[PDB]
Every structure is written in C-alpha cells, then in structure tokens.
Symmetry: C5
Subunit: 211 residues, 5 copies
C-alpha cells in the first residue's frame, strides 16, 4: 500500500464529521482567518451594496486528524476533501448574496492536526454608502466574520497575520478599477444579545476612495 | 474515546430523521420561533414586493435526542449537523424567492432534548404596497410562518420571547437605509380551509415608514 | 420502541422508491390534483409570460405503504420525507422557469396507503397575451399538468375537488394586485401524438381581467 | 413479491451505472434522438442569442437491462429512475445557459433492453442573427447535439423519425408568438480535430421568419 | 462477466477518490491543459468584465487507475464517471461567475493510467477594458489557470499542445460576432506570496479587436 492511501485510511476510517474535533469538549476551537481583497467588482449606491472578490484563508486544529510522520513515509502534509472533515460555520454577516462562490474540494492538513482551508469569496454585502462627496467620494464598508451558531466557548476567531501587515495588503489587488483600496482594518469584538451567549466576530473595514 | 464522540455515537447510532421526534404520537411538537429584522434591502412598489434580511431562530424538543450529562463528561450541550436530525417544515408563506438564504450546517442541542436552530433568511415577500403618501409613505407588510404540511395536532408554533420585547426590537437593525422600522407585531391564528384540518401560523407585521 | 419509529421501520425497511407502487402492474396509478391561485406576481406582455404563485396539492395510493393501525398504537397517519417514496412525475407544461419553487421535505401518509403531497409552485408559464383591450384587458392563460413520461396506462390525473368548487375558488387569493382572478376552469383531455401512446393531462385556465 | 419489485431487483441488483452498457466493448452505443420545437421564447439580436423551448426525446439499448417477460408476469416495459442507469452525455453545443431545464426523474425501459428518455430543454444558444431585413427578417439558427466526450466508436447519434417528418413538424408549436417556425432541418456530420478522434453530431437548423 | 464490467470492478473496488493518485507522495502530479476559445459572448466595458465560452480539456496520470489490456479483452481505454475518481482543483482565477458551466459526467481513461477530461467553461472574468480607441478598440484580457490549493510540489500545470499551435487556434471560433480573436498567448509563471509556498499557474492572454 502506498503511504498516502495508508495515511488516508488510518485517518478517515475512525473519524466522523459531525462532532467538533477536540479531545476535551471544555476547550474552544480557535480559528485563525485572513482576508485579501482581490478586486472590487461593483459599488452600488442605489441599492447600498458593494461586491468584493476577496481571497479567504483560514486554519484550525483537528485533534483527531494527527499522526506521527515516521510511520507514514515521513508524510508531513496531505490533502483530502473538505466535505470529509469538520469545517467551522464561520460566515460573514451583512451579506446579501454568496452563491457566486464555488465550493473548493480539498483542504491541506499537517501532521500536527492543523487544517488549512483556502477558498474564494464572491460575497456582496449591504452597507451604508453615501454619495455626498461624489467626485472625490471615500467609502467605508465592513466585513464581519463570525461563527454563525457556535459561541465563543466553542469557536473563537483570530488573525492569521499581524494586523498591520493585513491592514496594508495591496499585493494582489486588481488596481485598475474605478475604486482604490486604502486599507483593510481588522477588529475583534465579542458580540452578545442574550444574557448568557457570547459570540466572537472579526470586523474587516474595507476603505476605498473613488478615482 | 473522547466524550463528544461517545455522545454523538450514543445519540445518532439509534436515531433516524424521517419520523417526528416524539415518544407518543398523540402529542404535538411545539416549535418556538423568533424574528429579528437585520435590514430592509429593497421595497419595490412596481412589483409589490419587498426584501427583508431577517435573523431567524427557533427551537423544539427532540424526545429521542436526550441524555444524562454525568455519563458523558458532564456535556450539557453539543452541536451536530442539521441534516442529521428531524427539522420542522416551518416555511414562510407570501414568499417569492428564498434561494438567497444559505443552509446553515449545524444546530445546537441540549441534554434535555431541546434543539436550537439559528439561520438567516433572505426572503422576498409579496405584499400590498401603496404609494399614496409617497413623500411620507408608511407601509405595512406581513410575514407569516407556518408548518407547511403538518397540522396543529403535529406541529404548533409559539414565540421564543414575549410579544412586546420582539415588537420593539431594533437592536441589530441596519438603521441607515431609506426605510425605518417602527415595529414587528406578532400574531397567532389557526388557519383552516378543509372541514377537519387546522394549521398553526404566526404572522409578523413589519411596519416601516419612509425617510 | 415508540409507535412512530416501529411504523417507519415496518414501512421503509422493505420498500424501494424506484418502482411504481402497485401490487399489479396492469393497473394505473390514479393521481388526484388540485390547484389554488395564491397570487399573480407578474403578467409580461412583452415576453408573453406571466408568473403565478399557486398552492398545489395532490394525492395518490401507494399499495405498499399501508398498515393496520391497531398494530401500531392506532396510528392513522404519519409524515415521512418525500424523497423516501415514489412520487409521480406530474409536471406542468408551457413552463419557462420553475426553479423558484422550494422542495417540500415531508408528505402525509394514511393507513389506507393514500399519500398526500402539498407543495408550492412559483412557475412562470408562456402563453399568448394580447394587449388589444389594454385599458380593460382580459387575459386567458392556461396551466396543463401531465405525467411527463408515464402514459395513461401507468399514471392518470383526476380532480381532488368538484370542478365547480375549484372554478370559483378565490379563498386565499391576494386580491390587491393589478389583476383580478375571475375563475380557474379545469379540463381533462387525452393527449396523443404517436400511434400507440396516450397521456393524460389536466388543463387549468386562469381567467384574469385588469383593473 | 409483486412482479414490478421482482423485476426491479433482478435488474438493478447486478448492475452499475459507471460502465457503458454493452456486452462487447468493441461495438458502439447507437443513440437515436428527436427534436420538437414547442416554443421560441426570445430572439435577442443584441446579444446574438435566442431561446428555444424544445421537447427532446432519445432512446438507446442497454444490453444489461433486458429480461424475458414471461418470468415477470409478462411485464413488457417499466419505469425506473434516470439516475439509476447509464445515460449518454449527449449535449448540445453552442449553448449559453441550460440550467432552466428540470431533471426528469424517470425513464421508460422495455424488455428488449431499449431505454427511452423524454426530457424538456430550455436551452439558450449563441448563433449569428442579422437584422438586415428587420421588417421581414428570416433567421437561421442551429442546434447541434453531440456526445460531448465519447467518440463515434463509443457513441453514435441517429434520428428517431425520418428526416422529412421532423423537418415539417409544427404539431405542438406555440404558433402565436412573434416568430413562425418554417422547418427544423437535421444534418449528420462526423466532427474531428485531432488526427485520430472522430465524434458524431447531429445539427438541427431551426428556420424562423418574423411576423 | 463482460470485459468492461470486470475492468470497472477491478479498478474502482480498490480505489478511493480522496487521495492524490501517486504511488510515491514525493512526486508531483503533472497536469497538461489546453484552451480553445469557442465564442466571446459579451465584453462589458461598464462592469469591466467579459464572457468567454471556451472548450477546456486537460489530462493527468492516475498511478492507481492502470491495467494490462490483455487481461481485460484488450481494452485500451474506457469511460467512467468523473465523480468516481480524483480530479485536480485546477481553477481559473480572475473569475466572477462560473455557475453557467454544466458538470460533465464522464472522463476517458487509458490503460497507462492517463485520465482525459473534456469540459466546457462559461466563465466570466474581471479584467481591465479601456475604451480609449472605441471605434478601433483592441483589448487584452487574461485567463490564468492554477491549482487553487495544491502547491507546485503537489500539482504542476503544463501545455497539452505546443505554444505556437494554441496561440493561433481559431479552428472552432464563432467568427461572426462583434469581436475577432487575434490570438491566445500562453504563459507559465510560479506564483508565490508566502516564504515557502510556490504555486504553478498558466496565463492565457485572449487578444481581441473590435470590428
Ligand atoms: C478569542 O480570541 C481573541 C483573539 O485572539 C482573544 O483576544 C485576545 O486575547 C489575548 C489574550 O487574552 C489578548 O492579549 C489580546 O489583547 C486579545 N485581543 C486581541 C485582538 O488579540 C480572546 O481572548 C479569545 N477568547 C477566548 C475565550 O478564547
Ligand atoms: C473606517 O471606519 C473605521 C471604523 O470606524 C475607522 O477605523 C477607526 O478609525 C478611528 C479614527 O479615529 C480610530 O481611532 C480607530 O482606532 C479605528 N479603528 C480600527 C479598528 O482601525 C477608519 O478610520 C474609517 N476610515 C475612514 C477613511 O473613515
Ligand atoms: C398552540 O400554541 C399557541 C401559542 O402558544 C397556543 O395559544 C395559546 O394557548 C394558551 C393556552 O391555551 C393561551 O393562554 C393563549 O392565550 C393562547 N394564545 C397565545 C397567543 O398564546 C395554542 O393553545 C396551542 N395549541 C395547541 C393545540 O397546542
Ligand atoms: C399594520 O397592520 C397590523 C395588522 O392589521 C396592525 O396591528 C393592529 O392594529 C390595530 C389598530 O387598531 C390593533 O387594534 C390590533 O390589535 C393590531 N394587531 C396586532 C396583531 O398588533 C398595525 O397597527 C398596522 N400598522 C400601521 C402603521 O398601520
Ligand atoms: C382517467 O381519469 C379521468 C378523470 O377521472 C377519467 O375520465 C372520466 O371517466 C369517468 C368514468 O369513465 C367518466 O364518467 C367521466 O366523464 C370522465 N371524465 C371526467 C372529466 O371525469 C378517465 O376515464 C380515466 N382513464 C383511465 C384509463 O383511468
Ligand atoms: C378562456 O378559455 C377557456 C377555454 O377556451 C374558455 O372556457 C370555455 O368557454 C366556452 C365558451 O363558449 C365554453 O363553451 C367551454 O365549455 C369552456 N371550457 C371550459 C373547459 O370551461 C373560457 O370561457 C375562456 N374565458 C374567457 C374570459 O374568454
Ligand atoms: C453513425 O450513425 C449514422 C446515422 O445513423 C450513420 O450514417 C449513415 O450510415 C448508413 C449506413 O452506413 C448510411 O446508409 C447513411 O447514408 C448514413 N447517413 C445517414 C444520415 O443516415 C453512420 O454510418 C454511423 N456510424 C457508425 C460508426 O456507427
Ligand atoms: C438554413 O441553413 C441550412 C444549412 O445551411 C439550409 O439548409 C441547406 O440549404 C441548401 C440550399 O441550397 C441545401 O442545398 C442543403 O441541402 C440544405 N441542407 C440541409 C441539411 O437541409 C437552409 O436552406 C437555410 N434556410 C434558410 C431559410 O436560409
Ligand atoms: C512545472 O511544469 C513547467 C512546465 O512544464 C516546467 O517548466 C519547464 O521546465 C522545463 C524543464 O525544466 C524547461 O525546459 C522549460 O523551459 C520550463 N518552462 C516551460 C514553459 O516549459 C517546470 O519545470 C515544472 N516544475 C516542476 C516542479 O515540476
Ligand atoms: C497582450 O498582453 C500580452 C502580455 O503582456 C502580450 O504578450 C507579450 O507581448 C510582448 C510584446 O513586446 C512580448 O515581448 C512578450 O513576449 C509577450 N508575452 C507572451 C507571453 O506572449 C501581448 O503582446 C499583448 N497583446 C496586445 C495586442 O497588446
Ligand atoms: C434577542 C436576541 C438574541 C440573539 C440574537 S443573535 C441571532 C438571532 C437569530 C439568528 C441568529 C443570530 N446570530 C447568533 C450569533 N451569530 C450571528 C447570528 C439577537 C439578534 C437577538
Ligand atoms: C380547499 C382548500 C383546502 C386546503 C387549502 S391549504 C393548501 C392547499 C394546497 C397546498 C398547500 C396548502 N397549505 C396547507 C397548510 N400550510 C399552508 C399551505 C386551501 C388553500 C384550500
Ligand atoms: C411525434 C411526437 C411523438 C411524441 C410527442 S410527445 C413528447 C416528445 C418529446 C419529449 C416529451 C414528450 N412528451 C410526452 C408526454 N408528456 C408530455 C411530453 C410529440 C410532441 C411528437
Ligand atoms: C486541437 C483540438 C482538439 C480537440 C478539439 S474538440 C474539444 C476540445 C476541448 C474540449 C472539448 C472538445 N470536444 C470534444 C468532442 N465533443 C465536443 C467538444 C478541438 C476543438 C481542438
Ligand atoms: C500573504 C499571502 C499569502 C498567500 C496568498 S495566496 C491565497 C490566499 C488566500 C486564499 C487563496 C490563495 N491562493 C493560493 C494559491 N492558489 C490561488 C489562491 C496571498 C494572496 C497572500
Ligand atoms: C524519515 O526521516 C528520518 C529523519 O530525517 C530519517 O531517518 C528516515 O530515514 C526517513 N524515512 C524515510 C522513509 O524517508
Ligand atoms: C460532573 O459534575 C458533578 C456535579 O457538579 C461532579 O460531581 C463531577 O465530578 C463532574 N464530573 C466531571 C468529569 O467533571
Ligand atoms: C385502538 O382503538 C381501539 C378501537 O377504538 C381500542 O379498542 C384500543 O384500545 C385502542 N388502542 C390504543 C392503544 O389506543
Ligand atoms: C403471459 O402471456 C402468455 C402468452 O400470451 C400467456 O400464455 C400467459 O398466460 C401470460 N401469463 C400471465 C401471467 O398473464
Ligand atoms: C489481444 O491482442 C493480442 C495482440 O494483438 C492478440 O494476440 C490477442 O488475440 C488479443 N485478444 C483478444 C481477446 O482480442
């Protein structure tokens, strides 16, 4: 048997995707996320919505999906389908349409149990867009990523990179459109409405000025 | 075996999603629902439809999905996929398009058997919108949630919160659009057309005035 | 074991959805249908199409899905997923878009073997719409429901209610739009093009006049 | 056991849908197709596309799905789900959108092994539409059906009916639109680009003149 | 047992689609791709997007899906469903909508282990389109195909045909639209943002001038 097949069997034959992948239920599943703005397709002042094509990546730890490499031909990482493992329900609020995003089949996994998921997002979000300064307008729209259902005691959200490095990330931006990206400011806040439930969310402010 | 995996097996290995989860078929499955209006994307007088982005949550009791925590490391609640359990067919009438709503994967479950389902709704509804008072227009559109198929003797609908607390809920409203939300008035009515079938539905009147 | 679970097992453990549910293949599967027009969202003279939101219900007999109640705690009816049983391919011709219709999960079943399926239809149909009498225009569009593949010797279509009761059914119509519903006239005809195949279809004429 | 269930088991318990249904791999799977134009919803000169609602039927021989009727209560034909058998990938080129077409569940099968599949097509195709003779314009758009992947040595395409009978088929046309159908001319051609691969396709020219 | 069924069983009974199909994990899975532009449906300067209907084909080697023909009636190639085998996540960046593309069921396979996948692409891409030379405008938009997740050490991308033959391929172009295709220039580049990850992508520049 080839090493990859042996490892895949050893991992997925005694694993089920329903449960949150933690040995002890008393510990939360920390998720680190990152956002890169690839393009700004449309900014609609009439409908107060804008479309952003952003490259989204996140990683978390599956305490069940870990192995010792020397028993599997020193395999340090491998790829398996995303639908064969637990995936956090980290969803962006303020959304109005996300169906344009294709579902990526595979996710990378490392022998420590770390899972890396890279996916694109074609999300259109609803936010306030004023046209007061039309000729030299500057807009401030926000993306907030949250564990839709799980509370902070189950899922917590953190940054993959340092805040300043992602705040000034124009490395892959399509810098030839009507809008110019000034920054992507992150922000962490604990959101709570009921008297006992706290949810963790991460707000990304996309700052853009017309040209 | 970790506690979460043991509990998930104990629950789902002797459970099937087809049946209504009640020990005695003679008792109805009471469902408590709540509605929060997150935004009002569009109000179309031409087509007599308006779009509402509302946060919808509901809970019910699965008499099969219950356990004693002290046998499972004092696990009081856990999350499992929504497609692995019975889910009421509580659907909003007056709808014209609901495909924009993403399907949430997970639902919370408590050791009493209570199931909590949080999901977003991007529903567009058809209702009468008059433009008689255009400059200072005030509209009155309704959302009615009902068990589409099940009668009252199988599924009944109630309120999660007290009516007055939800009638004046503007806690998460996007209060920067063309429309302002004055209230969300609930109302319970038994709907019957045939001589023997009674269905339970809950009408939510979204009252909005232009600005 | 609770009665519902016992009945569900007894029914679905020795049943498969591929075959037409009849003890003798020589007899057709009679399907009784009913149509209620809930609203008329749009009437497009330019594209010669109109949209109708109609509440559709049908019932048929599954000779396999029958039981004696006294052996199952006097259970006279129960609900199971629609995708777990055979469902007739009764489709409306003249259609141009039906994707807006959500798939209802459950269907009611009675101990006689009768299956009841309630579903909504957001169908848009192509029909001739003349604008000759625009100010006082009256239109006559038709919906024809047929077993798309099965011939009359396999599937036959009948009316749930008497023709006159459904011809004057405005009980749930949204009577506040641009169009007023005058009647829904049914009609049964045997449709045949090849020299040996006869198909049963039921035409519903929706008569509407502008206002 | 009823005859239908016995036959369905006998057929599908020793059958798998992946392979091409032929006893000898050296022989091609001949597919006979037919096209009937039910309506011409739209002809867009701006985008150079037109929409045709056509009734499509095809049949082929499954050498595995055959039986002797006298062993199954003289059952000469039966219906089973289309997703439970092999189906040719006969796809129409020149297409721009086909998602509007619903997937038909069932297909008829005869004891000889013949499979009959009736399905509707809401395809919109891209073809050259000149507006030179606008007031009395006559257009000539084509539909070409081909085995997308399989070569002629695996799948071949033929006509169900004689060419002249289908060339003058206006039997179910919606003859009340802006366009009138003059004929549907078939044509068979072997398409080859690589030095060794030949693919069989059937071109249907829909001839229409404005009115 | 017929040869095709024997081969399909021998192949797929000891094979799983999760893993990358290589005997040794230390070697990358080289993928050869080709692009043919069938039509240019729309070029939108307003939204800075253009739609291209391109015929896409690719092939790779599955080291598990190989056999010796003389043991299977000299079967040199056969077709099996695409969802039953591993398929590279080679996705086109710069995309804005790909849902229009239908999923092809089957893929060809040869006894060496080579897998051939032919599929159509209805992708709309976002690229800079200037209207400076409107009457005689010439545009330069790019398609870049990459292994979305897998690095170069896992998936590498190459050309099926020689660059010059594909650079001057107008063999199936719909040469009757508003735009004329001057060439499809390929280009290979190793894309890297993190300090250790290198991804292989292939850029195809579609050069078009108005007429
Ligand atoms: C959830 O994650 C956030 C972000 O990682 C945590 O917030 C940080 O916590 C550390 C340590 O307590 C502080 O030094 C930082 O100042 C906090 N803020 C940020 C922006 O990093 C939070 O404590 C975590 N909560 C739980 C329950 O895990
Ligand atoms: C866009 O909005 C964000 C959030 O309100 C602004 O970020 C804050 O700016 C204030 C300015 O005094 C700072 O004190 C805060 O520390 C900032 N918060 C974060 C999380 O960075 C941002 O400045 C706004 N941009 C524009 C152009 O108005
Ligand atoms: C279905 O639920 C509704 C709402 O919970 C019930 O209506 C209430 O019933 C209680 C007790 O009979 C009354 O005190 C309330 O006045 C009723 N109305 C409201 C708005 O709460 C109804 O009785 C239930 N029916 C069944 C069959 O369970
Ligand atoms: C919107 O419509 C609802 C339902 O008709 C109104 O709610 C009712 O208002 C009347 C006013 O006399 C009260 O007597 C009822 O008790 C109310 N019913 C409920 C369930 O609250 C509402 O007032 C309307 N709003 C506007 C602005 O017209
Ligand atoms: C298919 O069903 C239709 C409608 O139920 C049948 O047509 C009726 O048949 C009865 C009895 O023969 C007549 O009294 C009615 O006048 C017919 N028309 C209507 C509108 O009810 C038809 O006979 C059935 N055919 C088969 C083969 O079952
Ligand atoms: C709409 O069309 C239907 C079908 O042509 C009409 O129904 C027929 O009307 C004629 C009038 O003489 C009657 O003789 C038939 O018996 C009717 N058939 C059925 C099945 O009811 C209907 O009258 C038309 N409505 C309008 C307003 O023109
Ligand atoms: C594929 O099918 C086509 C159409 O049935 C075949 O073309 C016909 O072949 C017959 C017999 O050789 C000729 O008499 C006809 O003139 C051909 N054309 C038409 C339009 O019928 C073709 O030979 C078949 N090829 C294979 C390899 O099966
Ligand atoms: C539409 O195009 C088709 C294909 O070019 C035409 O069909 C051909 O017409 C020529 C006319 O001389 C004949 O010689 C060919 O035999 C025809 N081929 C087939 C397969 O029938 C058709 O005439 C065109 N129609 C119009 C109105 O221009
Ligand atoms: C990935 O594939 C590319 C293209 O096949 C390789 O690039 C070529 O490599 C060969 C041999 O090293 C050179 O002769 C060519 O000049 C390279 N460029 C092109 C355009 O062919 C690349 O080496 C491969 N890398 C890996 C790690 O497999
Ligand atoms: C479209 O853009 C491509 C990429 O920039 C151009 O291709 C390059 O053209 C330059 C011209 O000096 C050559 O030196 C490069 O070798 C070309 N690269 C490749 C990969 O072919 C192309 O010329 C542009 N076309 C137009 C009409 O502007
Ligand atoms: C009173 C109240 C309680 C809870 C909430 S929150 C919420 C409500 C319904 C559906 C989903 C949610 N969310 C939970 C955490 N993740 C984001 C969405 C509100 C608004 C009011
Ligand atoms: C005469 C008559 C009988 C019953 C109804 S109800 C209905 C009808 C068809 C399809 C669905 C329903 N519903 C059932 C309960 N849940 C809401 C929808 C009518 C209108 C007339
Ligand atoms: C000559 C001829 C034969 C049969 C038909 S019918 C048809 C044709 C193709 C696809 C579907 C159908 N249908 C069968 C019964 N159910 C409605 C659709 C025609 C038009 C011509
Ligand atoms: C050089 C060349 C070779 C083959 C073709 S064909 C093709 C190409 C890519 C994807 C699909 C196809 N097809 C195969 C047969 N069925 C229709 C589509 C071309 C154009 C050029
Ligand atoms: C700092 C940085 C690191 C990596 C990338 S890449 C990327 C990021 C998120 C999601 C997907 C990707 N991709 C990986 C390779 N395949 C194409 C997409 C960037 C932009 C910045
Ligand atoms: C795995 O790595 C260890 C440490 O580098 C080495 O000793 C061993 O030989 C390696 N085994 C294989 C199969 O490469
Ligand atoms: C569970 O809770 C009970 C009551 O608080 C306690 O006595 C027991 O030690 C707990 N067990 C674990 C494993 O935490
Ligand atoms: C079922 O109904 C019969 C007849 O009414 C009655 O005699 C019997 O006691 C019932 N059984 C149960 C369990 O309700
Ligand atoms: C089947 O058909 C044959 C020939 O017509 C006949 O002899 C036989 O009795 C039939 N069997 C049944 C069960 O109808
Ligand atoms: C397979 O091919 C070999 C070599 O051409 C030949 O000797 C053998 O007879 C063939 N077998 C069959 C079954 O065709």
């Amino acid at each position: 048997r080839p090493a990859l097949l042996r490892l895949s069997d050893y991992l997925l034959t005694n694993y089920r995707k329903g449960v949150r992948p933690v040995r002890d239920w008393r510990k939360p599943t920390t998720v680190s996320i990152d956002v890169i703005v690839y393009a700004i397709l449309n900014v609609d002042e009439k409908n107060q919505v804008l479309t952003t094509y952003i490259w989204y990546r996140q990683y978390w730890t599956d305490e069940f999906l870990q192995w010792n490499p020397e028993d599997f031909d020193n395999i340090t990482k491998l790829s398996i389908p995303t639908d064969s493992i637990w995936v956090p329900d980290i969803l962006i609020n303020e959304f109005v349409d996300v169906g344009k995003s294709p579902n990526i089949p595979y996710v990378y996994i490392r022998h420590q149990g770390e899972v890396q998921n890279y996916k694109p997002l074609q999300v259109v979000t609803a936010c306030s867009l004023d046209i007061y300064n039309f000729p030299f307008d500057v807009q401030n729209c926000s993306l907030t990523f949250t564990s839709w259902l799980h509370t902070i005691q189950d899922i917590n959200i953190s940054l993959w990179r340092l805040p300043e490095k992602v705040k000034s990330d124009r490395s892959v931006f399509m810098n030839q459109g009507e809008w110019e990206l000034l920054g992507v400011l992150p922000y962490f806040r604990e959101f709570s409405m009921e008297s006992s439930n706290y949810y963790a969310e991460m707000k990304f402010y996309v700052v853009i000025r017309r040209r």
